[PDB]
Symmetry: D2
Subunit: 255 residues, 4 copies
């Protein structure tokens, strides 16, 4: 079924995770046709500034995510940054996420694949659509069975990203495709006004799921404040994409 | 608002080809009554890569052929101009005067089109940022244009490649009606037909005021853009699909 | 010999042209090894705003340029924007310049070639280096014998241009290459601080000439105010590029 | 200031290959006394496109081979790290710790290199703007780095292509010494050796603190970057040329 990956950008506190988790649980009950996966990072490994928020550590993060899975019975996903983190994370993560900048790091991919868990690789801003084939092959070599490729924008000049929707049908040739509606509109080193419009495009073209970061009060988020979606708007956007998908799916090309 | 569909053969290879495509467009206009069809075809391809490629049969012949289409089928007409002097004669048959992408900044050409009293559709240059189309519209308004369109046809992305930045649609909608060019946006400067349909679906899901599509009875035999012109028999199905997606997505279109 | 095309961006007045022309004449006498060509546009056909300065017309422009050629005996070059302007311009212009946005307009190229004059085509911001071969062929078809291709930057994201120096050796395969030091640093819709550094790169790589707009008081220019080079700095930059060229020329690849 | 030349085989294919290249570099260091040579070679290619491509013989073997080069030729050494834990062992032989382009933003890796007390050279990411390297340097300084370098190795320009924006050299010089990577800047992601020499000439004419060049006795047989590694016999001539261009251009280098 259609996948929806959502949650707060960073694990600011398990309290925050539980609040967002509650709403995601509710939506989960309202849209039985959709598979929800709760996402949150235990560490922001590449903030621009050394003085910005990174997180509270892997242990605190895995624990908080554990609380969410136990308290709401929701699937979990979080990203790893070095090979050694794959094993401890796979304890609670149903899907291991590979950061865009690290999509080419062979050891990280193999470490993730070895855990037996599903792997979702964010397509690097520097990577061409057809070059993701090699990424998938590495993961298969490492034993991965459930593989996802996430479109999150491509470098377009300086401090700007563009979404080349031709990438969706191309990557679909070798993996399930997810569209990241949050980071695709960000300006490296973004405009929330473009999040919904581009999400509509993604489902009209055809993808296997959408990725969206949401926060009760984006204004106060410790990361991606200007792009995280207000929690109260999540339901409406999901309903909208299911409606558009229902109609457009009739024309999705056979890949 | 009535959705605009601009379609027709890339070039006026012959008056016969035009009537053949025109006949099909006329039939679709009778079916899709919620759509405003505009027949398009260039009397001249002024910037073919090679000096040896087909350009056309001249302005006189072209206007004459386009007039035959309007007279026989009662369809609106659009064609592009390349120099200021062409605006007047072309305005005699063209309901919408098209401004080529490479020429979207030529002040005199814009002014020439504007003073004819006809609608003007400017192809956004492959080098132009979406927010910079504001001054292009300002020039047209200054010149007397009352009905203005901006067409998204891709942006330079490395060498011999174009990418469609759909953020341009809501941005340009701030100052003009927006049209999505489904044919030229997938061509590799100096074409990939498999991406025509998916990208047009994205355009209507995002929200635009119309779509531009070149169609030919037999693309394979086309004298220009043979790789991207849509087979005529496929037009009806594409239009039905974009109307369906437009309908379901419409309640979510943001207000400017 | 090495070509140096210089002059004020636009013909603000024949007075301005004579002042710049005087200095160019002087430099002409100081550097006999260089072929100087005076440049100035009689019309800025694509200003962003309808309210910006365009010029005083073709007649006034051709007349002013005529005064410069007669009073100083300097070669002349100016750009045309529509086919009909080719003939009247060729009366005084030794080199007819084709604007970057119009480098693909067949009739404009043929009209310029038919005049018998030399033709310098500014490479479009949208054009790939290898695609200039077709441009040259069009001009040869039209009778052109002396053909130049000018590097002036390539579209790089929005409102930015990058100079891919690989273009110099590539275009050299079919025409003489000129490097435009002024427009290459401009930000469409620029930083004067990068003009000199990039000029040095151009001569180190290897070109047949340089193009530079200069004005007695750039601060007061009616066009390209932030990028035109102060007249007083022209001599030093020219001396610098001749010195660098003298040394680097030993390594210019055989094309 | 003493010009820096970082050179060596892309990968440590064997300790034998290293000594062969090292011998030539040692000879050039005796001739070009105004140059500070640093021998470079990766103990691991952690991001080859294919899982089937050559990666290396391990960290232990690599450090051992690099140590043999330093001991036998008395040359400075540099190699890249891919994860935080590698910084300590690598710092035992490496005078300069290199940070891969894709990893230029990984805070922990930067911090790990910085606390070793060794110099750190960060390859500017293909996705990073020149002005955004300021925070990368800030992180290193925060971590204890006293000698920092930023290497220009090209920027993403469309698909499978990189362009070198030479404006980056004077921009990055504001906060660190700048090195120009002559090998990777001409490679087509997922190589054009004919552009290596001309672009390196541009780099020195613009002004940099050093150049980075991969060289192999027989590029054709290289296990990595066989298309762009410079034939060893050509190194001397390239170095002489950049020193000559640097000299003549130097009086014109702008002050930061
Ligand atoms: O503006 C021109 C449009 O891109 C056309 O598709 C153009 O005529 C391309 O022509 P060619 O196939 O000669 O490059
Ligand atoms: O960062 C990696 C450098 O670009 C190398 O040249 C890299 O290993 C490229 O490898 P491949 O030839 O497998 O794509």
């Amino acid at each position: 079924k259609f996948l929806v990956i959502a949650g707060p950008c960073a694990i600011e506190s398990e309290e925050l995770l539980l609040k967002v988790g509650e709403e995601i649980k509710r939506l989960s009950e309202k849209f039985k046709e959709v598979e929800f996966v709760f996402k949150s990072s235990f560490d922001k490994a590449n903030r621009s500034s050394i003085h910005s928020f990174r997180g509270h550590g892997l242990e605190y993060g895995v624990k908080a995510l554990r609380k969410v899975k136990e308290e709401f019975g929701l699937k979990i996903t979080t990203d790893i940054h070095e090979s050694w983190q794959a094993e401890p994370v796979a304890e609670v993560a149903d899907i291991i996420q590979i950061p865009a900048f690290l999509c080419g790091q062979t050891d990280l991919l193999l470490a993730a694949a070895k855990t037996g868990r599903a792997v979702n690789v964010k397509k690097g801003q520097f990577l061409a659509p057809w070059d993701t084939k090699n990424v998938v092959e590495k993961l298969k070599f490492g034993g991965a069975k459930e593989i996802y490729l996430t479109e999150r924008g491509t470098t377009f000049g300086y401090n700007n990203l563009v979404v080349d929707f031709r990438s969706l049908p191309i990557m679909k040739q070798w993996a399930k495709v997810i569209y990241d509606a949050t980071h695709s509109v960000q300006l490296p080193g973004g405009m929330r006004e473009f999040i919904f419009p581009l999400i509509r495009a993604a489902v009209a073209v055809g993808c296997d799921g959408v990725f969206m970061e949401t926060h009760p009060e984006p204004e106060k988020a410790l990361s991606d404040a200007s792009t995280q979606l207000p929690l109260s708007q999540l339901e409406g956007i999901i309903e909208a994409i299911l409606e558009i998908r229902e109609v457009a799916s009739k024309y999705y090309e056979t890949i």
